Amino acid sequence: DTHKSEIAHRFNDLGEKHFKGLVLVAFSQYLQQCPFEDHVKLVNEVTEFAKKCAADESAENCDKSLHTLFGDKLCTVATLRATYGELADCCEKQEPERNECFLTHKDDHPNLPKLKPEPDAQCAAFQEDPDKFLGKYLYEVARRHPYFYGPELLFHAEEYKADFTECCPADDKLACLIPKLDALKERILLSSAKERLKCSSFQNFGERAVKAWSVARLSQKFPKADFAEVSKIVTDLTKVHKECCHGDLLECADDRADLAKYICEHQDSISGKLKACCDKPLLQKSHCIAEVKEDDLPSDLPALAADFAEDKEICKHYKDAKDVFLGTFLYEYSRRHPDYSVSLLLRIAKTYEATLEKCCAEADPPACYRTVFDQFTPLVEEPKSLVKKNCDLFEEVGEYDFQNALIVRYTKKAPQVSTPTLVEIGRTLGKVGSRCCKLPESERLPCSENHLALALNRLCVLHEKTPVSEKITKCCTDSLAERRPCFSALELDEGYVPKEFKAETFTFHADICTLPEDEKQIKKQSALAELVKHKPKATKEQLKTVLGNFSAFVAKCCGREDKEACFAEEGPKLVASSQLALA
């Protein structure tokens, strides 16, 4: 078989730490609400069985697929029906039905307590049992991010470990640690969103979309890599993420390490950016490769016209070599467009395709498609200008205000979406501005739009469980490449029924005062979303004014000796008048 004992195989390939680590992740992700130590128990159990199997691969049940095994193990959890009404059902199922059911049950918004950099308790529990602590952390993250890129989560566990290692004996324990952990969780959220997108793309669009994505993306990254090489990496990487996305984390990690190895063996024909990565220890390397910056364009990028616009037998290649020719196009076009977002590239590929599909059905395809690259211009311009308008706004207005505009913007598009989601999305989209907008300008488009894809996908993912808007559905389930334009193209449904006004929603209390700023913002942005839901027609500018008024009022009442009296005295008036200020 593919390996006598997949479990042994993986155990042997990954080694215990990573294997347990990934099993922990795998398990945490599948069974998100389970006590950490029950996951540890299961991981141990499975790891134990790994070890037995590694010792005797012909042992009873060592033959079983990883999933049967892990599904089996998960299905043994105590409170299975209790904790996971859904999952129990899954457990009656054989693989892969069972895994599929299990994945489906994966909760993308388990809304678990926020992992708070709690330096003392954490440093303590890390100093007590760094293994349990990192485990916990894998668990905490995995369960919060049921699709987090397993291997990556082990890598992040290292950073998490490295953070605590650096910061625990420091006198300045909080201020060594909180920013690291803050950054880590951000890196986590982003990585998570990245992997979520990958996984969503598999789920929702299939491997070919993931592939085309990865082609576009790895072409950008590895522009000096030949197509074959990109393709190879894409196939492998797709497999990696397919596995990971399917909770086949061991395979995923193992394949990933294979891939990293492969990439590092081939770094010279892949990218000079890999050298840094390929010098790194395993997880770092893989991480580094995953996150690798795009290589310099090779100075021998081929003119694309010749093959892709001018070549007379394009239709022929298009007909008998579609995937490849398009893949090639995508590769070629993407490697020379690190300045475009992947989805843009994919849209461009789709237009390229559509244009061949058009041109080749016509009388002189060549005269039709010779202008094929020219049809990319509008595809380019739209996101470029959206990125500009957004960076401009962002620049002008700053993250929170930008988030607010985004919250308004998305709440308008999708007012049925839960406030927290809307806030989350607009918040994340604002973090996109902050991330992307400050980048060298040619990086903002790919940045914004790539990151936008992450956040939309987040919304989409959320929308999967909690479908509230067909328009979201449509945007989420139509072309992944079009998803961002689709969302961008959303505006307010002049159908949507303003959410009934509930004063309390905008009623602030002094509790807000003790909130960290991001939570006060969230509270404001939540009210803001709510202001929008209630007054969908209210312009962002009215909303901004009103939120302004709310913020001021909050700021003021928080600064009052009697915070609550302030909120109590002044809130309702503002709540009432706010409404006047809207639609």
Coordinates of C-alpha atoms in Angstrom, one line a residue:
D1 CA 0.0 0.0 0.0
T2 CA 0.9 3.7 -0.4
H3 CA 2.6 3.0 2.9
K4 CA 2.1 -0.3 4.8
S5 CA 1.1 1.8 7.7
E6 CA 0.2 5.4 6.8
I7 CA 0.3 6.2 10.6
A8 CA 3.7 4.6 11.0
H9 CA 4.8 6.2 7.8
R10 CA 3.7 9.6 8.9
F11 CA 5.0 9.1 12.4
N12 CA 8.3 8.0 10.9
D13 CA 8.4 10.9 8.4
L14 CA 7.2 13.6 10.7
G15 CA 8.7 12.4 13.9
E16 CA 6.8 12.2 17.1
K17 CA 6.8 15.9 17.9
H18 CA 5.3 17.0 14.7
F19 CA 3.2 14.0 14.4
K20 CA 1.7 14.6 17.8
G21 CA 1.6 18.3 17.0
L22 CA -0.3 17.8 13.9
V23 CA -2.5 15.2 15.4
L24 CA -3.2 17.7 18.0
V25 CA -3.9 20.3 15.5
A26 CA -5.9 17.8 13.4
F27 CA -7.9 16.8 16.4
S28 CA -8.3 20.2 17.9
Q29 CA -9.6 21.3 14.5
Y30 CA -12.0 18.5 14.1
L31 CA -13.2 18.5 17.6
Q32 CA -12.9 22.1 18.6
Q33 CA -14.8 22.2 21.9
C34 CA -13.0 19.3 23.4
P35 CA -10.9 19.9 26.5
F36 CA -7.3 20.2 25.5
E37 CA -6.2 17.3 27.6
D38 CA -8.9 15.1 26.0
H39 CA -7.3 16.0 22.7
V40 CA -3.8 15.3 24.2
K41 CA -5.2 11.9 25.3
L42 CA -6.4 11.2 21.8
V43 CA -3.2 12.4 20.2
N44 CA -1.2 10.3 22.6
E45 CA -3.5 7.3 21.9
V46 CA -3.0 7.8 18.2
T47 CA 0.6 8.5 18.6
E48 CA 0.9 5.4 20.7
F49 CA -0.8 3.5 18.0
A50 CA 1.6 5.3 15.5
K51 CA 4.4 4.0 17.6
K52 CA 3.0 0.4 17.8
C53 CA 2.5 0.6 14.0
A54 CA 5.9 2.0 13.4
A55 CA 7.2 -1.0 15.3
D56 CA 5.0 -3.5 13.6
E57 CA 3.4 -2.1 10.5
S58 CA 1.6 -5.4 10.1
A59 CA -0.1 -5.0 13.5
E60 CA -3.9 -5.1 13.7
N61 CA -5.3 -1.9 12.3
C62 CA -1.9 -0.3 11.4
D63 CA -3.0 -0.8 7.8
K64 CA -5.9 1.6 8.4
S65 CA -5.8 4.9 6.6
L66 CA -4.9 7.9 8.7
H67 CA -8.4 9.1 8.5
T68 CA -10.0 5.9 9.5
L69 CA -7.6 5.9 12.4
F70 CA -8.1 9.5 13.4
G71 CA -11.8 9.4 12.7
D72 CA -11.8 6.3 14.8
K73 CA -10.0 8.1 17.5
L74 CA -12.1 11.3 17.4
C75 CA -15.2 9.1 17.3
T76 CA -14.1 7.7 20.7
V77 CA -14.3 11.0 22.5
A78 CA -16.4 10.8 25.6
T79 CA -19.0 13.5 25.0
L80 CA -19.3 13.0 21.3
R81 CA -23.0 13.3 21.0
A82 CA -23.2 15.7 23.9
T83 CA -20.5 18.1 22.7
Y84 CA -21.0 17.5 19.0
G85 CA -24.6 16.7 18.1
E86 CA -23.6 16.6 14.4
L87 CA -20.3 14.7 14.8
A88 CA -21.8 11.6 16.4
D89 CA -23.5 11.1 13.0
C90 CA -20.2 11.4 11.3
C91 CA -18.8 8.7 13.6
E92 CA -21.3 6.1 12.2
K93 CA -19.7 6.8 8.9
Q94 CA -16.8 5.1 7.3
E95 CA -14.1 7.0 5.6
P96 CA -14.1 9.2 3.7
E97 CA -17.7 9.9 4.3
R98 CA -16.8 10.2 7.9
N99 CA -14.0 12.8 7.5
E100 CA -16.2 14.7 5.0
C101 CA -18.8 14.9 7.7
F102 CA -16.3 15.9 10.2
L103 CA -14.9 18.6 8.1
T104 CA -18.4 19.9 7.3
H105 CA -18.9 20.1 11.1
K106 CA -15.7 22.0 11.5
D107 CA -16.7 25.2 13.0
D108 CA -15.2 28.3 11.4
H109 CA -16.5 30.5 14.0
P110 CA -16.5 28.6 17.2
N111 CA -16.2 32.0 18.9
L112 CA -13.9 30.6 21.5
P113 CA -12.6 32.8 24.2
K114 CA -10.1 35.2 22.8
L115 CA -6.6 33.9 23.4
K116 CA -5.3 36.7 25.5
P117 CA -1.6 37.1 25.9
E118 CA -1.9 36.4 29.7
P119 CA 1.9 36.6 30.2
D120 CA 2.1 35.4 33.8
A121 CA -0.3 32.5 33.8
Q122 CA 1.0 31.6 30.4
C123 CA 4.7 31.9 31.2
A124 CA 3.9 29.9 34.3
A125 CA 2.1 27.1 32.4
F126 CA 4.9 27.2 29.8
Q127 CA 7.5 27.1 32.4
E128 CA 5.6 24.3 34.1
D129 CA 5.0 22.2 31.0
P130 CA 6.3 23.8 27.7
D131 CA 5.0 20.7 25.9
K132 CA 1.5 21.0 27.3
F133 CA 1.7 24.7 26.8
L134 CA 2.6 24.5 23.1
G135 CA 0.2 21.7 22.7
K136 CA -2.5 23.8 24.3
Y137 CA -1.6 26.5 22.0
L138 CA -1.8 24.3 18.9
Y139 CA -5.0 23.1 20.3
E140 CA -6.2 26.7 21.0
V141 CA -5.3 27.8 17.6
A142 CA -6.3 24.7 15.8
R143 CA -9.7 24.7 17.4
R144 CA -10.2 28.3 16.7
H145 CA -9.0 27.8 13.2
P146 CA -10.2 24.4 12.3
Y147 CA -8.5 24.8 8.9
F148 CA -5.4 26.5 10.0
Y149 CA -2.5 25.2 7.9
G150 CA -1.4 22.4 10.2
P151 CA 2.3 22.4 9.6
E152 CA 2.2 26.1 9.8
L153 CA 0.5 25.9 13.1
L154 CA 3.4 23.8 14.4
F155 CA 5.6 26.5 13.0
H156 CA 3.6 29.1 14.8
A157 CA 3.7 26.9 17.9
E158 CA 7.5 27.4 17.6
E159 CA 7.2 31.1 17.4
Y160 CA 4.7 30.9 20.3
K161 CA 7.3 28.8 22.1
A162 CA 10.1 31.2 21.0
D163 CA 8.0 34.1 22.2
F164 CA 7.5 32.5 25.6
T165 CA 11.1 31.3 25.6
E166 CA 12.3 34.9 25.0
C167 CA 9.7 36.6 27.1
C168 CA 9.1 34.5 30.1
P169 CA 12.3 35.2 32.1
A170 CA 12.3 38.8 31.0
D171 CA 11.4 41.4 33.7
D172 CA 9.3 43.1 31.1
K173 CA 7.4 39.9 30.6
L174 CA 4.1 41.4 29.3
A175 CA 5.8 43.9 27.0
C176 CA 8.3 41.4 25.7
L177 CA 5.5 39.0 25.1
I178 CA 2.1 40.7 24.4
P179 CA 3.4 42.3 21.2
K180 CA 5.0 39.1 20.0
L181 CA 1.8 37.2 20.9
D182 CA -0.3 40.0 19.4
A183 CA 1.7 39.7 16.2
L184 CA 1.6 35.9 16.4
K185 CA -2.1 35.8 16.7
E186 CA -2.3 38.3 13.8
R187 CA 0.1 36.1 11.9
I188 CA -2.2 33.3 13.0
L189 CA -5.3 35.0 11.9
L190 CA -3.8 35.9 8.6
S191 CA -2.3 32.5 8.0
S192 CA -5.5 31.0 9.1
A193 CA -7.4 33.2 6.6
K194 CA -4.9 32.2 4.0
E195 CA -5.4 28.6 4.6
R196 CA -9.0 29.0 5.0
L197 CA -9.1 30.5 1.6
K198 CA -7.1 27.6 0.3
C199 CA -9.4 25.2 1.9
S200 CA -12.5 27.1 0.9
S201 CA -11.2 27.1 -2.6
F202 CA -10.8 23.4 -2.5
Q203 CA -14.2 23.1 -0.9
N204 CA -16.1 25.5 -2.9
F205 CA -14.3 25.7 -6.2
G206 CA -12.2 22.7 -6.3
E207 CA -8.6 21.9 -6.7
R208 CA -8.3 23.4 -10.2
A209 CA -9.2 26.7 -8.8
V210 CA -6.8 26.2 -6.0
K211 CA -4.3 25.2 -8.6
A212 CA -4.9 28.1 -10.8
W213 CA -4.7 30.2 -7.8
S214 CA -1.4 28.7 -6.8
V215 CA -0.2 28.8 -10.3
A216 CA -0.9 32.5 -10.5
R217 CA 0.5 33.0 -7.1
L218 CA 3.6 30.8 -7.3
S219 CA 4.3 32.2 -10.7
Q220 CA 4.3 35.6 -9.2
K221 CA 6.5 34.3 -6.4
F222 CA 8.7 32.2 -8.6
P223 CA 8.8 34.1 -11.7
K224 CA 12.2 32.7 -12.6
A225 CA 10.8 29.2 -12.1
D226 CA 9.7 27.5 -15.3
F227 CA 6.1 26.6 -15.7
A228 CA 6.8 22.9 -15.2
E229 CA 8.4 23.8 -12.0
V230 CA 5.6 26.1 -10.9
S231 CA 3.2 23.4 -12.0
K232 CA 5.0 20.9 -10.0
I233 CA 5.2 23.0 -7.0
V234 CA 1.5 23.9 -7.5
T235 CA 0.5 20.3 -7.8
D236 CA 2.4 19.4 -4.8
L237 CA 1.4 22.3 -2.9
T238 CA -2.2 21.8 -3.8
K239 CA -1.9 18.3 -2.6
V240 CA -0.4 19.6 0.6
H241 CA -3.2 21.9 1.2
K242 CA -5.8 19.6 -0.1
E243 CA -4.6 17.2 2.5
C244 CA -4.4 19.8 5.1
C245 CA -7.8 21.2 4.2
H246 CA -9.1 17.7 4.5
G247 CA -7.6 17.4 7.9
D248 CA -5.1 15.0 6.5
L249 CA -2.5 17.1 8.4
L250 CA 0.1 14.4 8.7
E251 CA 0.1 13.8 5.0
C252 CA -0.2 17.4 4.5
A253 CA 2.8 18.1 6.7
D254 CA 4.8 15.3 5.3
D255 CA 4.0 16.3 1.7
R256 CA 4.7 19.8 2.6
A257 CA 8.1 18.9 4.0
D258 CA 8.6 17.0 0.8
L259 CA 7.6 20.1 -1.1
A260 CA 9.8 22.4 0.9
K261 CA 12.6 19.9 0.3
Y262 CA 11.8 19.8 -3.3
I263 CA 11.6 23.5 -3.5
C264 CA 14.9 23.9 -1.6
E265 CA 16.5 21.3 -3.8
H266 CA 15.4 23.4 -6.7
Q267 CA 15.6 26.7 -5.2
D268 CA 18.0 27.9 -7.8
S269 CA 15.6 27.3 -10.6
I270 CA 12.8 28.4 -8.4
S271 CA 13.7 31.6 -6.7
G272 CA 16.6 33.3 -5.1
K273 CA 14.2 34.3 -2.3
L274 CA 14.2 30.7 -1.3
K275 CA 17.8 30.6 -0.3
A276 CA 16.9 32.3 3.0
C277 CA 14.1 29.8 3.4
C278 CA 16.0 26.8 2.3
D279 CA 18.7 27.5 4.9
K280 CA 16.1 27.5 7.6
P281 CA 15.2 24.6 9.9
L282 CA 12.3 22.5 8.6
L283 CA 9.2 24.3 9.7
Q284 CA 10.8 27.7 9.3
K285 CA 11.8 26.7 5.9
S286 CA 8.4 25.6 4.8
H287 CA 6.9 28.6 6.5
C288 CA 9.6 30.7 4.8
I289 CA 8.8 29.1 1.5
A290 CA 5.1 29.6 2.0
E291 CA 5.6 33.2 2.8
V292 CA 8.4 33.7 0.5
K293 CA 8.5 37.0 -1.2
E294 CA 8.3 37.1 -4.9
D295 CA 11.5 36.7 -6.7
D296 CA 12.8 39.4 -9.0
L297 CA 11.4 39.0 -12.4
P298 CA 13.8 37.3 -14.6
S299 CA 15.1 39.6 -17.2
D300 CA 14.2 36.9 -19.8
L301 CA 10.4 36.8 -19.2
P302 CA 9.2 35.9 -22.6
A303 CA 7.2 38.4 -24.6
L304 CA 3.7 37.1 -24.1
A305 CA 2.2 38.5 -27.2
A306 CA 4.0 36.0 -29.4
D307 CA 2.6 32.9 -27.8
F308 CA -0.5 34.1 -26.3
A309 CA -1.8 36.8 -28.6
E310 CA 0.0 36.6 -31.9
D311 CA 0.7 32.9 -32.4
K312 CA -1.6 31.7 -35.2
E313 CA -2.2 28.3 -33.6
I314 CA -3.3 29.6 -30.3
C315 CA -6.8 28.3 -30.9
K316 CA -5.2 24.9 -31.7
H317 CA -3.1 25.0 -28.4
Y318 CA -6.2 26.3 -26.7
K319 CA -8.2 23.4 -28.1
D320 CA -6.0 20.5 -27.6
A321 CA -3.9 21.8 -24.7
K322 CA -6.4 24.0 -22.8
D323 CA -5.4 23.5 -19.1
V324 CA -1.8 23.7 -20.0
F325 CA -1.9 26.5 -22.4
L326 CA -4.0 28.5 -20.0
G327 CA -1.9 27.3 -17.1
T328 CA 1.0 28.5 -19.1
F329 CA -0.7 31.7 -19.8
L330 CA -1.5 32.1 -16.2
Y331 CA 2.0 31.2 -15.2
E332 CA 3.5 33.5 -17.7
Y333 CA 1.1 36.3 -17.0
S334 CA 1.3 35.8 -13.3
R335 CA 5.1 35.5 -13.0
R336 CA 5.4 39.0 -14.6
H337 CA 2.6 40.4 -12.6
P338 CA 3.6 40.3 -9.0
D339 CA 1.9 43.6 -9.2
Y340 CA -1.5 42.0 -9.7
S341 CA -3.5 40.2 -7.2
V342 CA -3.8 36.5 -7.7
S343 CA -7.5 36.8 -8.2
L344 CA -6.9 39.6 -10.7
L345 CA -4.5 37.2 -12.5
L346 CA -7.1 34.6 -12.3
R347 CA -9.6 36.9 -13.8
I348 CA -7.1 37.9 -16.4
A349 CA -6.6 34.2 -17.1
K350 CA -10.3 33.8 -17.3
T351 CA -10.6 36.7 -19.7
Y352 CA -7.6 35.4 -21.5
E353 CA -9.5 32.1 -21.8
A354 CA -12.8 33.7 -22.4
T355 CA -11.2 35.7 -25.1
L356 CA -9.7 32.6 -26.7
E357 CA -13.0 30.8 -26.2
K358 CA -14.5 33.8 -28.0
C359 CA -11.8 34.4 -30.6
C360 CA -11.4 30.7 -31.5
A361 CA -15.1 30.3 -32.2
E362 CA -14.9 33.2 -34.7
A363 CA -13.7 33.3 -38.3
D364 CA -10.2 34.7 -37.9
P365 CA -9.4 33.9 -34.3
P366 CA -6.0 35.5 -34.7
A367 CA -7.3 39.0 -35.5
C368 CA -9.8 38.5 -32.7
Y369 CA -7.3 37.4 -30.0
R370 CA -4.4 39.5 -31.0
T371 CA -5.8 42.1 -28.7
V372 CA -6.3 39.6 -26.0
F373 CA -3.9 41.2 -23.6
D374 CA -5.8 44.4 -24.1
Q375 CA -8.9 43.0 -22.5
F376 CA -7.0 42.7 -19.3
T377 CA -6.7 46.4 -18.9
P378 CA -10.2 46.9 -17.4
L379 CA -9.6 43.9 -15.3
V380 CA -6.5 45.5 -14.0
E381 CA -7.9 49.0 -13.7
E382 CA -10.9 48.1 -11.5
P383 CA -9.0 46.5 -8.7
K384 CA -6.2 49.0 -9.1
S385 CA -8.5 51.9 -8.6
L386 CA -10.4 50.1 -5.8
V387 CA -7.0 49.6 -4.1
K388 CA -6.2 53.2 -4.7
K389 CA -9.6 54.5 -3.4
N390 CA -9.1 52.2 -0.4
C391 CA -5.6 53.1 0.3
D392 CA -6.4 56.7 -0.2
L393 CA -9.3 56.4 2.2
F394 CA -7.1 54.4 4.5
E395 CA -4.3 56.9 4.3
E396 CA -6.7 59.8 4.8
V397 CA -8.7 58.2 7.5
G398 CA -6.6 55.5 9.2
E399 CA -7.3 52.0 10.1
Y400 CA -10.3 52.4 12.3
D401 CA -12.1 54.9 10.1
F402 CA -11.2 52.8 7.2
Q403 CA -12.6 49.8 9.0
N404 CA -15.6 51.8 9.7
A405 CA -16.0 52.7 6.1
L406 CA -15.5 49.0 5.3
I407 CA -18.0 48.0 7.9
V408 CA -20.4 50.4 6.5
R409 CA -19.5 49.3 3.0
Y410 CA -20.0 45.6 3.9
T411 CA -22.9 46.1 6.1
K412 CA -24.5 47.8 3.2
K413 CA -23.7 45.0 0.9
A414 CA -24.6 42.4 3.4
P415 CA -26.7 43.9 6.2
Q416 CA -28.1 40.5 7.0
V417 CA -24.6 39.4 8.0
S418 CA -24.1 39.4 11.7
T419 CA -22.6 42.4 13.1
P420 CA -19.6 40.6 14.5
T421 CA -18.9 39.2 11.1
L422 CA -19.4 42.5 9.5
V423 CA -17.3 44.2 12.0
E424 CA -14.8 41.4 11.8
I425 CA -14.7 41.7 8.1
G426 CA -14.5 45.5 8.0
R427 CA -12.0 45.3 10.7
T428 CA -9.9 42.8 8.8
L429 CA -10.3 44.7 5.6
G430 CA -9.0 47.7 7.5
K431 CA -6.1 45.7 8.7
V432 CA -5.7 45.1 5.0
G433 CA -5.4 48.7 4.3
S434 CA -2.9 49.0 7.1
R435 CA -1.0 46.1 5.7
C436 CA -1.2 46.8 2.1
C437 CA -1.5 50.4 1.7
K438 CA 1.8 51.2 3.2
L439 CA 3.5 48.7 0.9
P440 CA 5.4 49.9 -2.2
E441 CA 2.6 50.8 -4.5
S442 CA 2.9 48.0 -7.0
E443 CA 2.5 45.7 -4.0
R444 CA -0.8 47.3 -2.8
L445 CA -3.0 45.7 -5.4
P446 CA -1.8 42.1 -4.8
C447 CA -1.6 42.8 -1.2
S448 CA -5.1 44.3 -0.8
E449 CA -6.8 42.1 -3.2
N450 CA -5.1 39.0 -1.9
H451 CA -5.9 39.9 1.6
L452 CA -9.3 41.0 0.6
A453 CA -9.8 37.5 -0.8
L454 CA -8.9 36.3 2.7
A455 CA -11.4 38.4 4.4
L456 CA -14.1 37.8 1.9
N457 CA -13.5 34.2 2.1
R458 CA -13.7 34.5 5.8
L459 CA -17.1 36.1 5.3
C460 CA -18.0 33.5 2.8
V461 CA -16.9 30.8 5.1
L462 CA -19.0 32.3 7.8
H463 CA -21.8 32.7 5.5
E464 CA -21.6 29.0 4.7
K465 CA -22.7 28.1 8.2
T466 CA -24.8 31.1 8.6
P467 CA -26.2 32.0 5.2
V468 CA -28.0 35.3 5.5
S469 CA -27.7 36.9 2.2
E470 CA -28.1 35.5 -1.2
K471 CA -25.9 38.2 -2.5
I472 CA -23.2 37.0 -0.2
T473 CA -24.0 33.5 -1.3
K474 CA -23.8 34.5 -4.8
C475 CA -20.5 36.3 -4.4
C476 CA -19.1 33.6 -2.2
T477 CA -20.1 30.7 -4.5
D478 CA -19.5 32.3 -7.8
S479 CA -16.1 32.5 -9.4
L480 CA -13.6 32.6 -6.6
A481 CA -11.7 34.9 -8.8
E482 CA -14.8 37.2 -9.1
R483 CA -15.6 37.0 -5.5
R484 CA -13.9 40.3 -4.7
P485 CA -15.3 42.1 -7.7
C486 CA -18.6 40.5 -6.8
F487 CA -18.5 41.8 -3.4
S488 CA -17.1 45.1 -4.5
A489 CA -20.1 45.2 -6.9
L490 CA -22.5 44.6 -4.1
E491 CA -24.2 47.7 -2.9
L492 CA -27.2 48.1 -0.7
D493 CA -30.1 45.9 -1.5
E494 CA -32.9 48.5 -1.9
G495 CA -34.8 45.3 -0.9
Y496 CA -33.2 44.8 2.5
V497 CA -35.4 45.7 5.4
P498 CA -33.6 48.0 7.8
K499 CA -33.1 46.1 10.9
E500 CA -35.6 47.3 13.4
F501 CA -34.2 49.8 15.7
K502 CA -33.2 48.5 19.1
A503 CA -31.9 51.4 21.2
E504 CA -29.8 49.1 23.4
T505 CA -27.7 48.2 20.5
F506 CA -26.5 51.8 20.4
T507 CA -26.7 52.2 24.0
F508 CA -23.3 52.4 25.4
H509 CA -22.4 51.8 29.0
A510 CA -19.3 52.5 30.9
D511 CA -18.3 48.9 30.5
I512 CA -17.0 50.0 27.2
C513 CA -14.5 52.2 29.0
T514 CA -12.4 49.4 30.3
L515 CA -12.3 47.8 27.0
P516 CA -8.9 47.7 25.2
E517 CA -9.0 50.1 22.3
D518 CA -9.7 47.3 19.7
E519 CA -12.6 46.2 21.7
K520 CA -13.9 49.7 22.2
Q521 CA -13.6 50.0 18.5
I522 CA -15.3 46.7 17.9
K523 CA -18.0 48.0 20.1
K524 CA -18.2 51.2 18.1
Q525 CA -17.9 49.4 14.9
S526 CA -20.5 47.0 16.0
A527 CA -22.8 49.9 16.7
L528 CA -21.7 51.3 13.4
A529 CA -22.7 48.1 11.7
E530 CA -25.9 48.3 13.6
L531 CA -26.3 51.9 12.6
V532 CA -26.0 50.7 9.1
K533 CA -28.4 47.8 9.5
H534 CA -30.9 50.1 10.9
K535 CA -30.2 52.9 8.4
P536 CA -28.9 51.1 5.4
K537 CA -29.4 54.2 3.2
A538 CA -27.4 56.3 5.5
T539 CA -24.3 57.4 3.8
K540 CA -21.0 56.3 5.1
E541 CA -20.5 59.9 5.8
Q542 CA -23.5 60.2 8.0
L543 CA -22.5 57.0 9.6
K544 CA -19.1 58.3 10.2
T545 CA -20.5 61.5 11.6
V546 CA -22.8 59.6 13.8
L547 CA -20.2 57.2 14.9
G548 CA -18.0 60.1 15.5
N549 CA -20.7 61.4 17.7
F550 CA -20.8 58.0 19.4
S551 CA -17.1 57.8 19.8
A552 CA -16.9 61.2 21.2
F553 CA -19.7 60.4 23.5
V554 CA -18.0 57.2 24.5
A555 CA -14.7 59.0 24.8
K556 CA -16.3 61.6 27.0
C557 CA -18.4 59.4 29.1
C558 CA -15.4 57.1 29.6
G559 CA -13.6 60.2 30.8
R560 CA -16.4 61.2 33.2
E561 CA -16.1 60.8 36.9
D562 CA -19.4 59.0 36.7
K563 CA -18.9 57.1 33.5
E564 CA -22.2 55.4 33.7
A565 CA -24.2 58.5 34.6
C566 CA -22.6 60.0 31.6
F567 CA -23.5 57.2 29.3
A568 CA -26.9 57.1 30.9
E569 CA -27.5 60.8 30.6
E570 CA -26.1 61.4 27.2
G571 CA -26.4 58.1 25.4
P572 CA -30.1 58.1 24.8
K573 CA -30.2 61.5 23.4
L574 CA -27.3 60.6 21.1
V575 CA -29.0 57.3 20.3
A576 CA -32.2 59.1 19.3
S577 CA -30.5 61.9 17.4
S578 CA -28.0 59.6 15.7
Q579 CA -31.0 58.1 14.0
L580 CA -32.0 61.5 12.8
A581 CA -28.6 61.9 11.5
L582 CA -29.0 58.8 9.4
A583 CA -30.7 57.8 6.2

